[PDB]
Amino acid sequence: ANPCCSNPCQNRGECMSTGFDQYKCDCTRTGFYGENCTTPEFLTRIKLLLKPTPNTVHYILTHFKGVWNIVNNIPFLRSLIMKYVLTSRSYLIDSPPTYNVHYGYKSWEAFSNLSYYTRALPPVADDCPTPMGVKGNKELPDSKEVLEKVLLRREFIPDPQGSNMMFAFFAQHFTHQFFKTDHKRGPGFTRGLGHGVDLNHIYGETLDRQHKLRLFKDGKLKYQVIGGEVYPPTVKDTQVEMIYPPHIPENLQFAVGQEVFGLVPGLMMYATIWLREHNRVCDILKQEHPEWGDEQLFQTSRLILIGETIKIVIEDYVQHLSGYHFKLKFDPELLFNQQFQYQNRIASEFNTLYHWHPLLPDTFNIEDQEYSFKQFLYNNSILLEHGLTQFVESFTRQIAGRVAGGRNVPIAVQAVAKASIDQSREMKYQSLNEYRKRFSLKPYTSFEELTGEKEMAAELKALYSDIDVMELYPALLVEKPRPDAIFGETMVELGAPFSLKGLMGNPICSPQYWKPSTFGGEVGFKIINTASIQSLICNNVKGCPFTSFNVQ
Amino acid sequence: ANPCCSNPCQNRGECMSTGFDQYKCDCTRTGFYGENCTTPEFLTRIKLLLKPTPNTVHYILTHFKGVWNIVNNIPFLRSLIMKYVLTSRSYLIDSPPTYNVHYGYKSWEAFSNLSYYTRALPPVADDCPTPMGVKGNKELPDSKEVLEKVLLRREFIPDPQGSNMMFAFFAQHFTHQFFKTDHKRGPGFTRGLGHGVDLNHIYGETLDRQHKLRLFKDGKLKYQVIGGEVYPPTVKDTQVEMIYPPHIPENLQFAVGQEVFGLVPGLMMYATIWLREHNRVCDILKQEHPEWGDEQLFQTSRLILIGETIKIVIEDYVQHLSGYHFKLKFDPELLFNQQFQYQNRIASEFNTLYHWHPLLPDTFNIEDQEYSFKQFLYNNSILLEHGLTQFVESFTRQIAGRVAGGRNVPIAVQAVAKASIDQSREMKYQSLNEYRKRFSLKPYTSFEELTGEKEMAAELKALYSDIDVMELYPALLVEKPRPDAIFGETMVELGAPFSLKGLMGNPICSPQYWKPSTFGGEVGFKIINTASIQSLICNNVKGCPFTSFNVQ
Ligand SMILES: COc1ccc2c(c1)c(CC(=O)NCCCCNS(=O)(=O)c1cccc3c(N(C)C)cccc13)c(C)n2C(=O)c1ccc(Cl)cc1
Ligand SMILES: COc1ccc2c(c1)c(CC(=O)NCCCCNS(=O)(=O)c1cccc3c(N(C)C)cccc13)c(C)n2C(=O)c1ccc(Cl)cc1
Ligand code: HEM
Ligand code: HEM
Ligand SMILES: *[C@@H]1O[C@H](CO)[C@@H](O[C@@H]2O[C@H](CO)[C@@H](O)[C@H](O)[C@H]2NC(C)=O)[C@H](O)[C@H]1NC(C)=O
Ligand SMILES: *[C@@H]1O[C@H](CO)[C@@H](O[C@@H]2O[C@H](CO)[C@@H](O)[C@H](O)[C@H]2NC(C)=O)[C@H](O)[C@H]1NC(C)=O
Ligand SMILES: CCCCCCCCO[C@@H]1O[C@H](CO)[C@@H](O)[C@H](O)[C@H]1O
Ligand SMILES: CCCCCCCCO[C@@H]1O[C@H](CO)[C@@H](O)[C@H](O)[C@H]1O
Ligand SMILES: CCCCCCCCO[C@@H]1O[C@H](CO)[C@@H](O)[C@H](O)[C@H]1O
Ligand SMILES: *[C@@H]1O[C@H](CO)[C@@H](O)[C@H](O)[C@H]1NC(C)=O
Ligand SMILES: *[C@@H]1O[C@H](CO)[C@@H](O)[C@H](O)[C@H]1NC(C)=O
Ligand SMILES: *[C@@H]1O[C@H](CO)[C@@H](O)[C@H](O)[C@H]1NC(C)=O
Ligand SMILES: *[C@@H]1O[C@H](CO)[C@@H](O)[C@H](O)[C@H]1NC(C)=O
C-alpha cells in the first residue's frame, strides 16, 4: 500500500510518498544522489575507500598493548583520540530527535511529546503487506519458538571478558533511570521525562517524591540505621510509593527514588551505596560551606553525584565492556571546540539493545549461600542478613553470563525475553539489516554469517527464511561475538552512539556548567573527577572491600 | 548577609560564598582572572581594543545605503554577514539554561523544571540588605510614583520608524505563544512549556485542546462561515476554554489556540489569518499528496506554518524594527558549520523587555470609526462588523507609539506598567547596570546619560539617587532612543540575543529537519522560503489588500 513500505531510500535519505504508488527520496546532505540515494558523490567515494570497518578498528583497539600504553601516557594524544571517539559516534544520532512509535515522519507532536521513546528508524507503516515491509511471510515466526530454539539457556555460558555481578547490577541500576516503560500507555512510552542521567532513580522523578525522600537537614536524604548500618528509609516513614508483593513486612519495604528497586537485592545494594554517597558528599560540602542551607547542599550534591556517575560509567564501566587497551576518559572540555548538542532523547532501540538478561547467573552466590531466582527476588532480608560488605565481596567474585553467542537467557526470565520479541513487533521495528545499514554496517548475507556457527543458524533459517527479515532483538543475543568478547558488532556499533550521547549530552557537561562553582568549588569538582567504582565502594561500604567490574 | 550580595564578580564570572563573610569568583573561560575577574588576559586586551561599540555598529548598519545595496546583492557576502549576526548574538545566552527566580546557583531543579522562566542573571538573594544588593536605600522608590512621573503618556508620541498597528498586533500575537505567565504559581512561571515558536497560540498548548480545535478532515482546523467569510469556531461548538467577560454572546466567543486572544480584535484578526493560512496549506498539501491522511496533513501544515512564522519574523518584522539597510535573512544552513544549540528556554528578562505597550495608540481607528480602549477590548463584533480586509487596511495606516524616549505608556493600561515594576522587584531583578554589564554594555554613569535629556533624568535622580540602583524595566521605556529609532541601546542589545535564539533554536532549523521532505516536499518547503507578511495577508484576506509593518 504505502509506496515507502520497501525502505527504498538508502544511506539515511528520507522516503516520502508522492502518490498512491510512487515515492521520492530526499538525499539532502547524505553524500549520495539518485533515485534511492545510492550514487555516491566524489568525496563520498574517497571516504568510503579509506574508512576501516568496525571489526578492523576493534582489532586495533584490543591489540598492540605496547603502543596503547604509550598513547595513554601522552595526554595530548589520549585527549585527541578520545575526542574522535566522542564526535564520530554522536553523528549517528538525530539530535533534536525525530521519529517515534506513532510517527514515521517528522512532526511537532513527535518532537515535543516527552512521554514517547524516540526512534532511530521510523516504524513500518501500518498497512505494509508484511511485518518488515514487503519482504518475508505475512507473519513473523512464533516468538515462543524463536525464544526456545536460540535464546533460552542450556548450559551457563560465562562471559569471557570476566564481567561479575557488581557489573551486572550496576548496569541494571544505572540503566533503569532512563528505561522506565509506561505500560499504562504502551511499550513505546516512558515515564523518565528527563531522558538521561538525572539520577531520578535516587532522588525521584517528581518534586513531590523527592521531598518525601529528603531529610531537609544538611541536604541529606532520609535513612535508617539497622544493626549499625545505614539503609534507605521505609515506605511507612516516607509515604513514597514502591512496588512490593503484599506479603513483604513493612519494615522491609525500602523506599528509594525508583519504585521497582525493591524487586532485587542487587538493585537495593546500589541504591544504598548511592544514598550513602549522597549524604557523604553533603558532609563534605557542609564543611566547605558552613554558610549554606539545606536546599543548596542537596542540589549541589545531586549535581556532583550526576558527575560521578558519568565518570564511573565511562572510565570503569564502558572501559570494562570495551576491552580496549586505550584508556577512555570523561572530559567534557574535549567537546568545547566541537559541534555537539547538549540534549538527549532516549531511543526505544537503545532500550531494546540494553536487555542484557544473559548476564544473570542461575543462582546468586552470597558468601556460602546460593539463592535461586525465587529465593532472590523481592527479598531484601538477604541484604540485611549478609550486609553490604559481604554483598560486594561475593558479587565481585561471581561471574556473569555472555550476552552474545546465543542460548544464554536464563529460563527464570523467559517471559521478559518473549515480551521483548512481542513488543518489538508491536512497535513495528524494522529489520536487523535495516538497523545495520542505519548505523553504517554491512548487511548480513546469511544466518551463518550472523551467528558464526551452523546449528543456531539453521534453526533461524527454518524460522525466518530470509536474512533480510531477521529481527533486531534476537539477532543481538545470537550474534557471533567479537573474539572472546561479550557482544557482537551490532550491539557495540548501535549501542555506543546512544550511550555516549546520553552521557555527554547532559547539561553538566556543557561549558557553562562544567566549572568548579557549579559543584561547590574545587573540592566538589574533584569528587567528580576522581570518582571510580572502587572509591564509590571504599568510601561507603564498611571495611573498604576491594571491588571491580571483572572477576579477579 | 550573603557575601555575594554586592555582585562582586565581573565579566560573567560566578560568585560563590566560601564562608559567612567571604566569597570566591569562578573566572573559568571568561577571558579574565583575578579576585573579581577584572584582569584581562592578553588576547582579551586585544579583543577589547578592536571591538566597536553597539552604537558605532548601529550607525554603520543604518548608513552607507549604497554600500549595503551592493552587499545585499552578493549572496556570498550577505550570507557571511548574517552568519556573524546569528553567532555573535547567541554567545550571550546560557544554553542549556541556568538560573531562575528561585535558584541563584545552578541546580538540576532549575535546569529540568520547565514551568519556570529562566533568568539571564541570578536573582538578588533574599537576605541582601538592599533590593539591588548592597547599593541604594532599603526600599526602592514607590512604583506608582515612577509610573506617573516618567512612564505615563501625556501627548501621544508616534514611532519615528513608522511602525503601524499591523506590527503592534503582530508582535502581541507572536510573543503571546511563549509569554504566558502562570499567575496561579507566580510571575516567574510560564504555561508555555514549549518555550519558543511552537504555534501553540494557534494549535493549543495541550493535545486535548488541539483535538477540540481540529476538524479531523484533510488536516484542517475547525472554522465557521459568517457572511461568506471564514472565522474561528465558537466555544459552544468546540468546548475549548476561552477567557471572556460574562456578557459576551456565545456566538461571539471565538475559540483559538491561545485562551486570551478574545481580549482584543487585533489578536483575533491574526488568529483568523493564521487559521485561514493553516487550512490553505492543507489544501496545497492534499493536492500534492492525495494519498495522505488527516493526521499527516495537519502535522506537516503545522511545521510549515512554524517555518513561515520564523521567516516573517526575521525578514519582515525584525527587518522593520532594526532599520538596517542590510537585508536580514532566514537561512538555517548558515549555522550548520557553526557551534549552536538547537534548544531554547524563555527568559524572564526577555518577557520584561517585550512589554511594548507604548506601541498602543489612544484610539483604534478602523475605517471611519475611532474606538476607545473600553469600546475595543473584548469586542469581536467589531471584527465581524468591518471584516478582515478593512481591518488590515486600517491598521496598516494607523501609526504606533514610540517605545523608548519616555512618557508614552497609554493611561488605559497603567495597571500593567505598574505590575511590571512591582513584579520585577518581586522576582528580585538585578539593576539596570548589572544587566548592561551582563550583555557587554558600558554602565550608565548618570540619569542624564540614560535619558539623553534633563527633565525626566532629574525626576529619576530624586527617586533613585544612585544610577547603579536604577531598575531595568523603567529604564527601557525612558532610555534615549537611537537617532529616530523606536528603541534605545539596552532594548536592542539585551533583546536581540534572546530573540534570535528563540527563532534559530527551533528544531525545524536543525540539519535533520531542514530539508524538503520534512515539509511535504519542495512545494511545502517553498511556502516557508517565500513567506512574507504581505503574502500572508494576500493569500488569506479578501481582495489581497496591501499591508506592511510601517505606515506609507
Ligand atoms: C567494544 O565493546 C564495547 C561495548 C560497549 C561500548 C563500547 C565498546 C563503547 C566504545 C565505543 O564507542 N566503541 C565503538 C567506537 C570504536 C571506534 N571509534 S571510531 O571513532 O569510529 C574510530 C575509527 C577508526 C579508528 C579509530 C582509532 N584509531 C586511531 C585506530 C581510535 C579511536 C577511534 C577510531 C561504548 C561507548 N560502549 C557502550 O557504552 C555501549 C553501551 C551499551 C550498549 Cl547496548 C552498547 C554500547
Ligand atoms: C536595531 O534595532 C533592533 C531592534 C530589535 C532587534 C534588532 C535590532 C535585531 C538585530 C540585531 O541582532 N541587532 C544587534 C546586532 C548588531 C551587531 N551585530 S554584530 O554581529 O555584533 C556586528 C558587530 C560589528 C560589526 C558588524 C557588522 N559590520 C560589518 C559593520 C555587520 C553585522 C554585524 C556586526 C534583532 C534580532 N532584534 C530583535 O529581534 C529584538 C526583538 C525583541 C527585543 Cl525586546 C529586542 C530585539
Ligand atoms: C535479577 C535480575 C533481573 C530481573 C529479576 C529482571 C527482570 C526484569 C523484568 C520482569 C522486566 C520487565 C519490566 C517491565 O517491563 O516493566 C525487565 C526489563 C528490563 N530489564 Fe531486567 N531483570 C534483571 C536484570 C537485568 C539486567 C542486569 C539488565 C541490564 C544490564 C536488565 C535490563 C532490563 C531493561 C533495560 C529492561 C526494560 C525496562 C523498561 O523498559 O522499563 N535487567 N527485567
Ligand atoms: C490593546 C492591546 C493590549 C492590551 C489590552 C494589553 C493588555 C495587557 C494586560 C492586561 C497584560 C497582563 C496580562 C497578564 O499578566 O496575564 C499584558 C501583558 C503583556 N503584554 Fe499586553 N496589551 C496589549 C498590547 C500589547 C502589545 C502590542 C505588546 C507587545 C508588542 C504587549 C506585550 C505584553 C506582554 C509580553 C505581556 C506579558 C504577558 C505574560 O507574561 O503572560 N501587549 N498586556
Ligand atoms: C503524548 O502522547 C500520548 C499518546 O497520544 C498522549 O496520550 C493520549 O492522551 C489522550 C488525551 O490527551 C488520551 O485520550 C489517550 O488515551 C492517550 N493515549 C495514550 C496512548 O496514552 C499524551 O497526552 C501526550 N502527552 C502530551 C504532554 O501531550
Ligand atoms: C516546578 O516548580 C514548582 C515550584 O516549586 C512546583 O510547584 C510546587 O509543587 C508543590 C508540590 O509538587 C506544591 O506543593 C507547591 O504549591 C508548588 N509551588 C508553586 C509555586 O507552584 C512544580 O511542581 C515543579 N514542577 C515539576 C514538574 O517538578
Ligand atoms: C594496522 C593493522 C590492521 C590489522 C587489521 C586486522 C583486521 C581483523 O579483522 C577481523 O578479525 C577478527 C578476528 O580478530 C575477525 O573475527 C573479524 O571477522 C575480522 O574482520
Ligand atoms: C529453556 C531451556 C531450553 C529449552 C529447549 C527446547 C528445545 C527446542 O530447541 C532445540 O533444542 C536443542 C537442544 O539445544 C537444539 O539442539 C536444537 O537445535 C533446538 O532447535
Ligand atoms: C567607519 C565609520 C565609523 C563611523 C562611526 C560613527 C559613530 C557614531 O557614534 C554614535 O553616533 C550616534 C548618533 O549617530 C550617537 O547617538 C551615539 O551616541 C554615538 O556613539
Ligand atoms: C532503487 O532504484 C532502482 C533504480 O535506480 C529501482 O530499480 C528500484 O526499484 C529502487 N528500489 C527498490 C526497493 O526497488
Ligand atoms: C528470603 O531470604 C531469606 C534469607 O535472608 C531466606 O531464608 C528466605 O527463604 C527467603 N524467602 C523467600 C520467600 O524465598
Ligand atoms: C573587587 O576586588 C577588589 C580588589 O581587586 C576589592 O577591593 C573589592 O572589594 C572587590 N569587589 C567589591 C565589590 O568590593
Ligand atoms: C462593541 O462594538 C460595537 C461596534 O461593532 C459598538 O457599537 C459597541 O458599542 C461595542 N460594545 C462595547 C461594550 O463597547
Short mmCIF file of C-alpha atoms in Angstrom, two decimals, chain A residues 99-377:
data_model
loop_
_atom_site.label_atom_id
_atom_site.label_comp_id
_atom_site.label_asym_id
_atom_site.label_seq_id
_atom_site.Cartn_x
_atom_site.Cartn_y
_atom_site.Cartn_z
CA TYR A 99 10.58 9.70 14.87
CA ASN A 100 8.71 7.64 17.47
CA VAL A 101 6.38 4.64 17.57
CA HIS A 102 3.43 6.64 16.20
CA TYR A 103 5.21 8.94 13.70
CA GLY A 104 7.21 7.67 10.72
CA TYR A 105 7.54 11.28 9.55
CA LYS A 106 8.77 14.31 11.46
CA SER A 107 6.06 16.23 13.31
CA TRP A 108 5.83 18.71 16.16
CA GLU A 109 3.98 16.07 18.20
CA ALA A 110 6.89 13.65 17.85
CA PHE A 111 9.45 16.30 18.81
CA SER A 112 7.62 17.87 21.74
CA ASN A 113 5.80 15.00 23.49
CA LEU A 114 8.34 13.78 26.06
CA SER A 115 6.29 10.71 27.08
CA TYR A 116 7.50 8.86 23.95
CA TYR A 117 10.67 6.97 23.46
CA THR A 118 12.25 8.30 20.29
CA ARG A 119 13.18 6.04 17.37
CA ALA A 120 16.38 5.81 15.34
CA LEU A 121 14.41 4.31 12.44
CA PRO A 122 10.77 5.08 11.64
CA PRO A 123 8.26 2.29 12.29
CA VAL A 124 6.99 0.11 9.48
CA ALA A 125 3.76 1.64 8.23
CA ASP A 126 0.57 0.01 9.49
CA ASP A 127 -0.67 -1.04 6.03
CA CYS A 128 2.58 -2.54 4.76
CA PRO A 129 1.94 -6.05 3.37
CA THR A 130 4.46 -7.78 5.67
CA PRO A 131 5.72 -7.01 9.20
CA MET A 132 9.15 -5.94 7.90
CA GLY A 133 7.74 -4.07 4.91
CA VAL A 134 7.46 -6.14 1.73
CA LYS A 135 9.87 -8.99 2.50
CA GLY A 136 9.07 -12.20 4.34
CA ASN A 137 5.86 -14.06 5.03
CA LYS A 138 2.72 -12.26 6.17
CA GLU A 139 3.55 -13.13 9.79
CA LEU A 140 6.88 -13.41 11.60
CA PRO A 141 7.95 -16.68 13.27
CA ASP A 142 6.32 -17.66 16.56
CA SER A 143 8.13 -15.78 19.31
CA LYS A 144 7.97 -18.70 21.76
CA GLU A 145 9.68 -20.81 19.10
CA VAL A 146 12.40 -18.23 18.45
CA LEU A 147 12.87 -17.92 22.22
CA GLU A 148 13.22 -21.65 22.86
CA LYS A 149 15.40 -22.61 19.89
CA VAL A 150 18.12 -19.92 20.03
CA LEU A 151 17.69 -17.75 23.14
CA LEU A 152 16.99 -19.87 26.24
CA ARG A 153 20.00 -21.03 28.24
CA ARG A 154 21.04 -24.67 28.18
CA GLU A 155 24.37 -24.55 29.99
CA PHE A 156 25.53 -21.37 31.70
CA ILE A 157 27.95 -19.65 29.32
CA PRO A 158 30.23 -17.34 31.34
CA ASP A 159 31.36 -14.03 29.95
CA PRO A 160 34.90 -14.49 28.55
CA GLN A 161 35.58 -10.84 29.44
CA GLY A 162 35.06 -11.71 33.11
CA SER A 163 32.16 -9.39 33.98
CA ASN A 164 30.94 -10.03 37.52
CA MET A 165 27.70 -9.33 39.40
CA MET A 166 28.87 -5.90 40.54
CA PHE A 167 28.84 -5.02 36.84
CA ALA A 168 25.53 -6.71 36.04
CA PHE A 169 23.66 -4.98 38.86
CA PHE A 170 25.40 -1.66 38.17
CA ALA A 171 24.17 -1.87 34.57
CA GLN A 172 20.68 -2.73 35.79
CA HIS A 173 20.71 0.05 38.40
CA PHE A 174 22.20 2.69 36.09
CA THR A 175 20.02 1.99 33.04
CA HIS A 176 16.74 1.88 34.96
CA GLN A 177 16.71 5.65 35.47
CA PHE A 178 16.08 6.22 31.74
CA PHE A 179 14.46 2.88 30.83
CA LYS A 180 11.09 3.21 32.62
CA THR A 181 8.44 1.97 30.19
CA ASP A 182 4.96 3.37 30.86
CA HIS A 183 2.91 0.21 30.49
CA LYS A 184 -0.29 2.20 31.09
CA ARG A 185 0.36 3.78 27.66
CA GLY A 186 2.31 1.16 25.70
CA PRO A 187 5.85 -0.13 25.14
CA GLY A 188 6.90 2.92 23.13
CA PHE A 189 6.25 5.23 26.08
CA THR A 190 8.46 6.20 29.01
CA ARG A 191 7.98 7.73 32.46
CA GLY A 192 11.55 9.06 32.56
CA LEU A 193 10.79 12.52 31.21
CA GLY A 194 14.38 13.62 31.92
CA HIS A 195 15.54 11.24 29.15
CA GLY A 196 19.01 10.74 30.58
CA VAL A 197 21.30 10.63 33.59
CA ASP A 198 19.30 12.76 36.01
CA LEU A 199 19.55 10.26 38.90
CA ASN A 200 15.77 10.17 39.35
CA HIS A 201 16.28 6.57 40.48
CA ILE A 202 17.87 8.03 43.62
CA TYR A 203 16.02 11.34 44.02
CA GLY A 204 12.63 10.61 42.47
CA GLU A 205 11.08 11.58 39.16
CA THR A 206 8.80 14.26 40.63
CA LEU A 207 9.44 17.06 43.10
CA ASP A 208 6.78 15.62 45.42
CA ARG A 209 8.54 12.24 45.54
CA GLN A 210 11.90 13.96 46.08
CA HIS A 211 10.66 15.90 49.10
CA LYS A 212 9.30 12.72 50.71
CA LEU A 213 12.76 11.15 50.36
CA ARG A 214 14.63 14.16 51.76
CA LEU A 215 15.59 14.87 55.37
CA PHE A 216 15.62 18.68 54.86
CA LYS A 217 18.64 18.93 57.15
CA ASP A 218 22.11 19.46 55.67
CA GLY A 219 20.89 18.49 52.20
CA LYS A 220 20.70 14.83 53.16
CA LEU A 221 18.36 12.02 52.18
CA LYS A 222 16.34 10.23 54.84
CA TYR A 223 17.83 6.99 56.12
CA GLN A 224 17.51 4.43 58.89
CA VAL A 225 20.13 2.53 60.87
CA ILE A 226 19.72 -1.25 61.07
CA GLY A 227 22.36 -3.16 63.02
CA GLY A 228 24.75 -0.21 62.95
CA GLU A 229 24.42 0.18 59.16
CA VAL A 230 22.80 2.93 57.08
CA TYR A 231 19.93 1.74 54.87
CA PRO A 232 17.21 3.58 52.91
CA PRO A 233 14.06 4.64 54.78
CA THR A 234 10.76 2.75 54.72
CA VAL A 235 7.51 3.27 52.84
CA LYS A 236 5.78 3.77 56.21
CA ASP A 237 8.13 6.62 57.17
CA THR A 238 8.24 8.44 53.82
CA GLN A 239 4.91 7.62 52.08
CA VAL A 240 6.67 7.23 48.72
CA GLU A 241 5.01 4.55 46.64
CA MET A 242 7.05 1.40 45.99
CA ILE A 243 6.25 -1.83 44.17
CA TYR A 244 6.20 -4.75 46.64
CA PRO A 245 4.32 -8.05 46.86
CA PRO A 246 1.59 -7.96 49.52
CA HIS A 247 3.43 -10.23 51.98
CA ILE A 248 6.51 -8.01 52.46
CA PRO A 249 6.76 -6.79 56.08
CA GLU A 250 6.53 -3.01 56.19
CA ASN A 251 9.91 -2.79 57.93
CA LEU A 252 11.30 -4.35 54.73
CA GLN A 253 9.54 -2.03 52.25
CA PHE A 254 12.52 0.17 51.48
CA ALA A 255 11.75 3.48 49.77
CA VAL A 256 14.09 4.78 47.05
CA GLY A 257 13.79 7.03 44.02
CA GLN A 258 12.93 4.24 41.59
CA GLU A 259 9.73 2.42 42.52
CA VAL A 260 10.87 -1.05 41.37
CA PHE A 261 14.26 -1.23 43.10
CA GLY A 262 12.83 -3.44 45.83
CA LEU A 263 12.50 -6.10 43.13
CA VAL A 264 16.08 -7.32 43.61
CA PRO A 265 18.58 -7.03 46.48
CA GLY A 266 21.23 -6.22 43.87
CA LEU A 267 19.38 -3.06 42.90
CA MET A 268 18.80 -2.27 46.58
CA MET A 269 22.54 -2.76 47.16
CA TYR A 270 23.50 0.05 44.79
CA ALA A 271 20.58 2.21 45.95
CA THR A 272 22.04 2.02 49.46
CA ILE A 273 25.57 2.72 48.22
CA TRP A 274 24.44 5.82 46.31
CA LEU A 275 22.24 7.06 49.17
CA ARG A 276 25.29 6.82 51.44
CA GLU A 277 27.39 8.61 48.81
CA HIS A 278 24.89 11.48 48.61
CA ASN A 279 24.99 12.04 52.37
CA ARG A 280 28.78 11.67 52.41
CA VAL A 281 29.09 14.48 49.86
CA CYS A 282 26.67 16.55 51.96
CA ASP A 283 29.09 16.31 54.88
CA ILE A 284 31.94 17.36 52.59
CA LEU A 285 30.01 20.33 51.18
CA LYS A 286 28.78 21.45 54.61
CA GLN A 287 32.35 21.54 55.94
CA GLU A 288 33.38 23.64 52.93
CA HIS A 289 30.26 25.84 53.16
CA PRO A 290 29.04 26.33 56.74
CA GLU A 291 27.04 29.28 55.35
CA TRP A 292 24.96 27.04 53.05
CA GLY A 293 21.37 25.98 53.63
CA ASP A 294 19.78 22.57 53.24
CA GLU A 295 18.42 23.28 49.76
CA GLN A 296 21.74 24.31 48.20
CA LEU A 297 23.57 21.40 49.85
CA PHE A 298 21.05 18.92 48.42
CA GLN A 299 21.10 20.40 44.92
CA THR A 300 24.90 20.64 44.74
CA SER A 301 25.30 17.06 45.99
CA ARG A 302 22.91 15.87 43.28
CA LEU A 303 24.94 17.64 40.59
CA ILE A 304 28.11 16.03 41.97
CA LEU A 305 26.61 12.52 42.04
CA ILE A 306 25.46 13.02 38.43
CA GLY A 307 29.06 13.82 37.54
CA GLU A 308 30.43 10.85 39.49
CA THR A 309 28.02 8.52 37.68
CA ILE A 310 29.09 9.72 34.22
CA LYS A 311 32.73 9.43 35.30
CA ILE A 312 32.31 5.85 36.55
CA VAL A 313 30.22 4.79 33.54
CA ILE A 314 32.81 5.98 31.02
CA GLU A 315 36.11 5.26 32.76
CA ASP A 316 35.23 1.99 34.57
CA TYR A 317 32.00 0.56 33.14
CA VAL A 318 32.39 1.32 29.43
CA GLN A 319 36.14 0.78 29.91
CA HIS A 320 35.46 -2.76 31.13
CA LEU A 321 32.97 -3.69 28.46
CA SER A 322 35.04 -2.35 25.63
CA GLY A 323 38.12 -4.47 26.34
CA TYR A 324 40.24 -1.72 24.78
CA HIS A 325 43.80 -1.12 25.88
CA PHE A 326 43.14 2.58 25.27
CA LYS A 327 42.02 4.32 28.47
CA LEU A 328 38.67 6.03 27.93
CA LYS A 329 38.32 9.44 29.56
CA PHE A 330 35.46 11.55 30.93
CA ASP A 331 36.44 15.10 29.94
CA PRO A 332 33.64 17.45 28.83
CA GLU A 333 36.24 20.02 27.72
CA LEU A 334 37.04 17.80 24.71
CA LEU A 335 33.77 18.88 23.05
CA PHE A 336 34.04 22.63 23.73
CA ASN A 337 35.54 23.35 20.30
CA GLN A 338 33.27 20.74 18.64
CA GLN A 339 29.73 20.86 17.31
CA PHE A 340 27.61 18.93 19.79
CA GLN A 341 24.03 19.09 21.08
CA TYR A 342 23.78 19.14 24.89
CA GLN A 343 20.44 17.33 24.89
CA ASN A 344 19.22 13.76 24.66
CA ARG A 345 16.07 11.76 23.95
CA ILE A 346 16.06 8.08 24.91
CA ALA A 347 15.53 5.79 21.92
CA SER A 348 13.36 2.69 22.04
CA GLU A 349 16.07 0.78 20.16
CA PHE A 350 18.54 1.78 22.89
CA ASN A 351 16.17 0.28 25.41
CA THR A 352 15.90 -2.93 23.36
CA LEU A 353 19.57 -3.27 22.98
CA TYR A 354 20.13 -2.90 26.70
CA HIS A 355 18.12 -6.05 27.63
CA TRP A 356 21.26 -7.83 28.91
CA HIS A 357 19.46 -10.61 30.82
CA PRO A 358 22.04 -13.23 29.67
CA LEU A 359 24.19 -11.53 32.32
CA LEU A 360 22.17 -13.20 35.07
CA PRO A 361 23.55 -16.41 36.61
CA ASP A 362 21.45 -19.43 37.52
CA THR A 363 21.99 -18.79 41.24
CA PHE A 364 23.09 -15.74 43.19
CA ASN A 365 26.08 -16.67 45.36
CA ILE A 366 26.39 -14.55 48.52
CA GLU A 367 29.01 -15.78 51.00
CA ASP A 368 28.33 -19.52 51.30
CA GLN A 369 24.72 -19.46 50.02
CA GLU A 370 23.37 -19.98 46.51
CA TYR A 371 19.93 -18.43 46.03
CA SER A 372 17.52 -19.40 43.29
CA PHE A 373 15.62 -16.68 41.45
CA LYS A 374 12.56 -17.42 43.60
CA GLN A 375 14.63 -17.05 46.76
CA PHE A 376 16.38 -13.92 45.44
CA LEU A 377 13.54 -11.83 44.02
#
